[PDB]
Symmetry: D2
Subunit: 463 residues, 4 copies
């Protein structure tokens, strides 16, 4: 880099390798590159200054350079201590883009990186847009830098957990800028959340352990979009997969999908006692994966009862799905290699190197697909990130922070993109596979009551 | 001395009753509604006009409604979907039913009319249960006065719901409706997993063809198209999928299917030159799933590989241009609901002609026409919703409201998620599944009650 | 004109059966290619074939190929429930002696076989045997040994029949050579496996119309039939567990993604109720036997099964399941033909609303043929092309005409050569529209084969 | 001061040892043999030259052979397959090993000759363990006097077995061999299920490409081709299969794949006109699995869809005409074992060129080159067989026998089924599987001992 020092990455000399991978990923992301080509001339993001907080992967690189290509300045950090691809961060920094991100941050460094996006030369940057994944940056602004939100036109939030936090703020009257729920586009939720975890969960388990999965027993906690994709990731490898759920509709889907639905607790009752644990069930499990976005769904008593040498991991947004704190307090951790630890249940101080009573924890309980592999593939993230670019254009052009008070009150909300845009994203994805979408005849369009151009479904439609 | 019915053969009743007793053990949600509401008789005074496939599963629905206090007069919503032993058992229990497998079009309309009329006069009906909207349409167009007495319509399927929403939009819908189709325990259970079970079932019964290794084209990839594609893919077919909706097409790709159009560039201009003949010439099986019109058209039928199987699992038989084939090609019956269509001409056929197609159920709903439709344990979810919707509307007594209040109440709505979850829980227990209970801390953490509902109404599952 | 040398359920079903034969011929390119290639040469002219195999539409195409090649035949089914009556009628209406209907009694079953053996009350001058399971072979050796002096060979279809032939060969009681048709790859690894994949869930749906997705199955056996059966149920979304006595087959089940379990605690079958894994069997919604062995779903297992479980057998003989115990102790309620509820509340009557019953399909006989139509034509194409080739080979070798010393040297149970197995497979592939690539001369030399094949050593397992 | 080795980085040894301790808990058949035979020391006096992929799994095999009394000297059988931490741990245990990931061809030969030679002269080897036949070949062609002391060869893989059988047919095989490949617990475990696990694993690690919805062509459908096709189909790829063997092609059709040829009508006449350009222009991924030569040839590589991935999972890299690509096209390294091959020409490339192919592992075994090969619990079966084979040939003592007895025993044999079964039983128990025991009556009924063998030698599984 030149006199440009406004970044922090593991190793800037990985930049050329990162550039090589970005050029490949561009060919895998036709929806995102289509927006680049469509809007480059109009510069719809000219004057936007975007605080971005999301896993600093190669896929995120293509997103960042699309926003910049459309006129935005950005300052970027990762939303997870383990999810950065260091060659991707290096390529972005070498392009002159402020990025503060490396694989293997401490918690203190994770907070520091987010603050380095917020501050430029020790004072708040004149941000006016936010892109977030999980709500951490959104939370830091509302709590520690509320003045900055006076100039911000909106937030575009990537993921289910982040959206939940936004909706709680909106209900409490504490959300200060409008948001777009990017997660609930169909080309995000039912693409990224499900098919992404199908690709990347068994990918990360293989890289982390190289264990044969076929013929072994898995327990997947949760059967939402991530749990659906995770269960398929394992079943298609030949695992015998059981599913836990609190939602009977999602449990019904798991049954019909061919899974046995079980609870870690006798009769499903989690009363906090060891006696409530179905030890017979847990003693047979070779792999447990948490997918819930909830708290403590693989708890201390479950970890005590798991089959020896079971693998434990989490593909939900936050690491508190597993009680890793209990394991930190009571058991000895033996690093196998980065983001793979054997947890010795024989005690706290030291271990027998040949002890047989351990669990294998991946990514210290952080998002396993990003921690132990590379997260979702470019062609899937293409859908999520075309939605992000559209969401950023829409909120920036709305200019919420400049509106009169009455107009602000009518626009202070958490919304999804219109279905027409969802379909236009999907169409580019289908063309990327070489699929050919049929066009309705006028009479056929009239018969089912839609425009030949779409949208083809009512907003109630679930796909 | 009960005579108020018409079935194919009343002596099939005891066989029907044996299968009803079995199906009850397969429908815990529906049977659970019997025990929960029997004491309270929530449908006492209800008089239900019902029009839906007169199968064994519909028999369990009928007797659940009667067990809760209703009187009913029943007909099937398709000419080939009735199981004659089911219709016999219902007739033999003293219930008016007018349905048999293999009705003519005239008999079909007559059967509906026999539910509407008792002793030559309109029955004092006050509730409607419909599957596809045919009964609803006849009442709005031919007996509008009976709608002044009816509290609501509970509609089973996507096509019927579309017809209701046309009326609500035109301001011509006379009573409120429940969209039963769009409960998750209906749409994502019946429409998808039901076709998964019953499509390859009907194709085997009708043809006994090996499916593994052969080429299929599924038109449509909504709930029925997803279930149908899986029905074929799990047998080892090489399945291709056509769609007009790019989101559904995207799901097909991600699900491992090649997305193709019958037409070059996807443009259906009506000409033979528009047809991808190389593609159509390779297809062994085409299945229509759309609820749309003429999605397997005459030029597609002309281009299909010799001895391809053609069938439809959408509600109505106009998805395939069977009118074209009746006019131009000779039909050779193999056995009931299986015809060879000889493309050599209309003036008879060579018994050993190689250039024919095999049509199943004359283009009518193939899973019900050539097999028995969805299995009991799946229809359990759909029909538990139907019962709850009937109670929901009957207890609100729309027809007793003044005109200004009816206007405010007039709608097409789904059942609240809380009922959808309650149905689902009974289905899961029937599999032996054990649902986990949230702790208070966990419920607060995700912002739900321990009792649910566990998802916002925006959630798509 | 006056043909009466048959017995079928209803001759008026002939036109229906012929419609289905014309369709099935278009699904059987290997067999129909043999018909086209050999009809003018008449390689079976003079052959007089006793046939005993399920009288299906597929068998009809096989029968008429043998006749088209010059043979005379006399036919019976090898199972009391497997005949398609419209197929039997069509064959009878063609003037071919056939004795077969769906729903024979055991006495009628034996009568039909003896009607093929005897013509006008006297032994037919048979010189060839085509068998499926060995019942016709057994009757000939026990009751009509003198007929075997004139028979050039037996072509045996199925694993169980082959085992009985090998027993006789070891004991010195086999009187004529046989071709093991089962162990062509285009038979065993086509028919036995993929056939059951197609037809097992087919028969369960037709007999019960039960949802299989989400329910628990136990498949006893993981040979070719157990592999195809397990897949038939898993592809429907059943949760499938597998039992095996063979650890290599058990290893395959594990790698294929199935949990391998035993009905008995620690796998030890001591004959007591206490050895039953009651917790396991109490969860099972469907048990399928696939072993060719005896009493692999036994009385104690039947007592422990989950209420309203389905019980069926897809092995060749019904003694895989202890149905005799059920006849002796429990009351049977017919639901419809080949579907019975077995009430475990007692023998003397039953409550019509009793919940403690099992559903037994086809009275424990081969369920895919008893409750549906067995394997589809395009699969049986492979099996029956092998049968025709095997019939031609043994007929042309003329074993019955050898001196005693030479008969002793020729008495064997053999398989068809790999080159023919490959030629059968090629026609099957073409029927799918598949395009097989041809080796270049240099490639053929590199891997040590002729460009035309055979492409694998005889040790190869596929 | 042990220095008799050569590895990338000896400081990786502790890491390698951690992974060996894990791998041992995943290999119950092989660790079972290690415990069973330790007291007897059946390989005391054995001096084994070993040439096989220096992975963690191979480390557990090496230490089993040493634990049973052998001395060994080891090399990898591929320039890319070594795991450097496994090689380090073995060297740090005092065992001669010459292996690293990313050898040159000259280094590859140097490593093998370092095992053959000790202190500048041929080692007194008396046993050979080989994977692919390269060590066997060098011994026969360059060190034939050493074979006078060697009791046998135990050969891991299909390609090496073929080379043994060619030698035996030509009279040039000098010592007996056991074909380890054809144990069922090797061939139908390693060759098939191992490639199912590790093919998509390598493609993900090398490219991170989405596979669902994309088009693959698998060349070959033997055991590796079957496992490979499943590896890709279970990810949602649309997989087409090519074969020269119509029986294997029949299996592909029945398994739900479309069987196609790169050449029009399957006829490879060496010209571009013979290529099915329409087919190859739609293929996103080509995988060769044959053990044959030039099955992804120059004309196919010219016709492949832009940006297609090309890889080989057969033993040797000549399945793909990489020599043509080296001569004619520019190579851009993406990262180790991943190259963009730019079809625009030889002398340089545009960094933004769109007309390239992605080659993995320079055409060498892709599961080992871009990932870690088969998992320990699969290699457990293969390597248990290897140990049994080494014990059997070392005990036969061929190198000591008189000439007539040699002639009786100069053969390529497989292990007996009883041992194949005992390996499988230990593998099943590792899954927690419970094998049922025959009753005496049942054993008699099917004609087997309660103890096995349970199948005749003809049985194909
Ligand atoms: N790793 C990834 O790449 C990735 C991708 C998308 C989302 N996520 C994260 O994954 C998490 C799940 O997201 P989602 O979109 O599937 O949400 P979702 O709402 O669709 O699914 C979560 C499911 O967990 C279930 N659940 C909650 N508590 C449970 C408990 N105690 N036991 C069992 N089941 C329980 C809920 O009933 C629900 O169906 C979120 O944190 C989201 O941000 C991760
Ligand atoms: N037979 C059964 O058991 C059964 C069960 C439920 C519903 N149905 C019926 O099946 C039909 C479809 O139901 P659904 O719930 O799947 O509806 P749906 O709206 O979910 O799906 C229909 C799909 O067809 C697609 N489509 C429309 N026109 C098309 C065309 N010309 N080419 C390609 N694709 C086209 C639409 O984009 C849509 O995705 C309706 O008639 C419904 O009543 C049948
Ligand atoms: N219904 C059909 O269409 C059809 C088709 C082909 C064969 N068959 C019959 O099916 C049977 C099986 O044929 P196959 O080719 O699969 O034979 P096979 O030898 O390949 O398989 C039988 C399996 O049963 C296992 N087994 C034996 N006893 C057992 C026990 N007590 N518990 C568990 N497993 C046990 C054996 O280890 C073996 O693997 C034979 O009777 C054959 O004739 C039926
Ligand atoms: N990478 C691994 O981990 C691994 C594992 C086991 C074996 N192998 C190697 O993989 C190769 C294949 O082994 P296998 O056990 O599957 O052998 P195999 O004999 O079972 O299968 C090879 C197949 O290739 C087919 N074939 C040959 N030439 C062809 C052509 N021109 N076009 C299409 N198909 C063609 C053959 O007909 C045969 O079925 C060998 O080199 C073997 O040593 C690699
Ligand atoms: C060409 C741009 C346009 N088709 C597009 C629209 C929406 C989303 C992504 C896109 O690439
Ligand atoms: C022409 C006949 C020939 N291709 C054939 C050979 C062997 C088996 C079946 C067949 O149909
Ligand atoms: K990635
Ligand atoms: K059949
Ligand atoms: K490995």
């Amino acid at each position: 880099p030149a006199g440009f020092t406004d970044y922090k990455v593991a190793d800037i000399t990985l930049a050329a390798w990162g550039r090589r991978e970005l050029i490949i990923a561009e060919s895998e992301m036709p929806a995102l590159m289509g927006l680049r080509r469509k809007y480059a001339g109009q510069q719809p993001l000219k004057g936007a200054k975007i605080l971005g907080c999301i896993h600093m992967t190669i896929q995120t690189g293509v997103l960042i350079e699309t926003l910049v290509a459309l006129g935005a300045e950005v300052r970027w950090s990762s939303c997870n201590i383990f999810s950065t691809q260091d060659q991707a961060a290096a390529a972005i920094a070498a392009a002159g883009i402020p990025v503060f991100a490396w694989k293997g941050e401490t918690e203190e460094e994770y907070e520091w990186c987010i603050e380095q996006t917020i501050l430029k030369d020790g004072q708040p940057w004149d941000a006016n847009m936010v892109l977030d994944d999980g709500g951490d940056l959104t939370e830091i602004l509302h709590k520690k830098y509320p003045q900055m939100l006076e100039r911000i036109h909106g937030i575009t939030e990537e993921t289910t957990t982040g959206v939940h936090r936004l909706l709680d703020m909106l209900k409490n009257g504490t959300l200060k800028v409008p948001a777009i729920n990017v997660n609930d586009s169909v080309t995000k939720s039912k693409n990224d959340n499900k098919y992404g975890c199908r690709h990347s969960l068994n990918d990360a388990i293989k890289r982390g352990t190289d264990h044969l999965l076929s013929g072994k027993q898995a327990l997947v906690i949760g059967y939402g979009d991530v749990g659906k994709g995770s269960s398929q990731s394992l079943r298609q490898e030949g695992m015998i997969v059981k599913v836990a759920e609190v939602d009977p509709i999602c449990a019904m889907q798991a049954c019909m999908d061919g899974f046995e639905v079980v609870s870690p607790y006798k009769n499903g009752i989690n009363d906090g006692t060891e006696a409530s644990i179905d030890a017979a069930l847990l003693g047979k499990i070779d792999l447990i994966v948490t997918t819930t976005g909830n708290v403590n769904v693989c708890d201390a008593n479950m970890l005590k009862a798991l089959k020896k040498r079971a693998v434990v991991c989490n593909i939900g947004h936050f690491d508190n799905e597993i009680d890793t704190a209990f394991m930190r307090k009571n058991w000895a951790w033996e690093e196998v290699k980065p983001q793979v630890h054997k947890i010795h249940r024989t005690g706290k101080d030291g271990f027998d190197a040949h002890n047989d009573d351990y669990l294998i924890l991946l990514a210290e309980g952080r998002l396993v697909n990003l921690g132990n592999a590379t997260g979702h593939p470019s062609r899937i993230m293409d859908g999520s990130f075309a939605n992000q670019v559209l969401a950023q254009i829409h909120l920036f052009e709305q200019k919420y922070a400049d509106l009169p008070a009455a107009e602000k009150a009518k626009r202070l909300s958490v919304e999804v993109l219109p279905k027409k845009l969802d379909e236009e994203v999907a169409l580019e994805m289908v063309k990327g596979f070489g699929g050919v979408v049929t066009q309705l005849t006028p009479k056929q369009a009239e018969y089912i009551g839609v425009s030949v151009e779409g949208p083809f479904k009512p907003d109630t439609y679930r796909y």
